[PDB]
Design an enzyme around this catalytic site. Structure first.
Site, mmCIF file in Angstrom:
data_model
loop_
_atom_site.group_PDB
_atom_site.id
_atom_site.type_symbol
_atom_site.label_atom_id
_atom_site.label_comp_id
_atom_site.label_asym_id
_atom_site.label_seq_id
_atom_site.Cartn_x
_atom_site.Cartn_y
_atom_site.Cartn_z
ATOM 1 C CD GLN A 274 0.058 -0.613 5.712
ATOM 2 O OE1 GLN A 274 -0.687 0.227 5.205
ATOM 3 N NE2 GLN A 274 -0.406 -1.655 6.458
ATOM 4 C CG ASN B 53 -1.813 0.105 15.190
ATOM 5 O OD1 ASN B 53 -2.970 0.459 14.915
ATOM 6 N ND2 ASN B 53 -0.886 0.958 15.696
ATOM 7 C CG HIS C 18 0.126 4.343 13.721
ATOM 8 N ND1 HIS C 18 -0.192 3.103 13.210
ATOM 9 C CD2 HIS C 18 -1.002 5.102 13.596
ATOM 10 C CE1 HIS C 18 -1.411 3.152 12.696
ATOM 11 N NE2 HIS C 18 -1.928 4.341 12.919
ATOM 12 N NE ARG D 169 -4.023 1.890 2.301
ATOM 13 C CZ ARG D 169 -4.362 2.987 2.986
ATOM 14 N NH1 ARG D 169 -3.622 3.385 4.046
ATOM 15 N NH2 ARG D 169 -5.475 3.632 2.642
ATOM 16 C CG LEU E 152 -0.537 8.726 11.313
ATOM 17 C CD1 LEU E 152 0.496 8.047 10.388
ATOM 18 C CD2 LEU E 152 -1.888 7.876 11.343
ATOM 19 C CG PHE F 5 -0.258 9.082 3.754
ATOM 20 C CD1 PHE F 5 0.153 9.571 5.036
ATOM 21 C CD2 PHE F 5 -1.345 8.210 3.652
ATOM 22 C CE1 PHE F 5 -0.491 9.101 6.218
ATOM 23 C CE2 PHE F 5 -1.977 7.724 4.832
ATOM 24 C CZ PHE F 5 -1.547 8.158 6.101
ATOM 25 C CG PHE G 238 3.424 3.685 8.362
ATOM 26 C CD1 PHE G 238 2.916 3.037 9.504
ATOM 27 C CD2 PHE G 238 3.575 5.089 8.388
ATOM 28 C CE1 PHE G 238 2.537 3.791 10.662
ATOM 29 C CE2 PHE G 238 3.199 5.813 9.518
ATOM 30 C CZ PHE G 238 2.666 5.190 10.659
HETATM 31 N N1 WM4 Z 1 -3.546 -0.754 9.026
HETATM 32 N N2 WM4 Z 1 -3.047 0.472 8.552
HETATM 33 C C1 WM4 Z 1 -2.340 1.250 9.384
HETATM 34 O O1 WM4 Z 1 -2.026 0.961 10.531
HETATM 35 C C2 WM4 Z 1 -1.918 2.616 8.834
HETATM 36 C C3 WM4 Z 1 -0.653 3.065 9.096
HETATM 37 C C4 WM4 Z 1 -0.243 4.296 8.636
HETATM 38 C C5 WM4 Z 1 -1.064 5.112 7.908
HETATM 39 C C6 WM4 Z 1 -2.371 4.664 7.642
HETATM 40 C C7 WM4 Z 1 -2.824 3.396 8.075
HETATM 41 N N1 WM4 Z 2 -4.869 1.377 11.962
HETATM 42 N N2 WM4 Z 2 -5.200 2.235 10.910
HETATM 43 C C1 WM4 Z 2 -5.888 1.810 9.840
HETATM 44 O O1 WM4 Z 2 -6.223 0.614 9.650
HETATM 45 C C2 WM4 Z 2 -6.222 2.863 8.764
HETATM 46 C C3 WM4 Z 2 -6.386 2.415 7.448
HETATM 47 C C4 WM4 Z 2 -6.719 3.281 6.389
HETATM 48 C C5 WM4 Z 2 -6.815 4.672 6.679
HETATM 49 C C6 WM4 Z 2 -6.589 5.153 8.003
HETATM 50 C C7 WM4 Z 2 -6.293 4.257 9.038
#
Ligand code: WM4
Ligand code: WM4
EC number: 5.2.1.8
Length: 165
Positions: free
Chosen positions: A63, A102, A126, A55, A122, A60, A113
């Protein structure tokens, strides 16, 4: 003692792109730093070698770390279960910051990421545990293969990885 350094050798549809290296803040977040270090060396029998960045959202972050399901649904820590948010001392201050993905509070596995901008929203959600040391230009190059919904236009893989002396 000295914070560990890790490298990723990145490829793009199998062709080499370049090397990204990271300082891991074991001095501040040892459990979290140690999970990423051990997954990078593959010393527990599993980890990031051969896995993908699934992703990538330009402007931004990039990941990665889902080495079991390759899509953001999988991954596992070295601890035999998801683990707690160690602290939130370090913040998402700009490009290069290395932080845990997470599923909410206290669900760290192996997904992570790399920020390509300041992402202060964040903070407190995070765990920041490292930063790009060399090769930020390779992460910029990777970024250009993402898109607005995060799907990559070419396969971005960790062809090799490990710990640097
Ligand atoms: N599962 N996706 C995430 O934890 C996430 C991490 C960083 C930015 C947006 C989403
Ligand atoms: N843990 N964060 C997420 O799963 C997330 C995924 C997409 C956009 C924003 C946040």
């Amino acid at each position: 003692m000295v914070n560990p350094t890790v490298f990723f050798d990145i490829a793009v549809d199998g062709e080499p792109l370049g090397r990204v290296s990271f300082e891991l803040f074991a001095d501040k977040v040892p459990k979290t730093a140690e999970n990423f270090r051990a997954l990078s060396t593959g010393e527990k029998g599993f980890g990031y070698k051969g896995s993908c960045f699934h992703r990538i959202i330009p402007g931004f972050m990039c990941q990665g770390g889902d080495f079991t399901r390759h899509n953001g649904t999988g991954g596992k820590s070295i601890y035999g279960e998801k683990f707690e948010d160690e602290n939130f001392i370090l913040k998402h201050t700009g490009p290069g910051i290395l932080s845990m993905a997470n599923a909410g509070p206290n669900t760290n596995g192996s997904q992570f990421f790399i920020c390509t901008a300041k992402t202060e929203w964040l903070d407190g959600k995070h765990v920041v545990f490292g930063k790009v040391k060399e090769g930020m230009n390779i992460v910029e190059a990777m970024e250009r293969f993402g898109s607005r919904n995060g799907k990559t236009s070419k396969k971005i893989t960790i062809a090799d990885c490990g710990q640097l002396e």
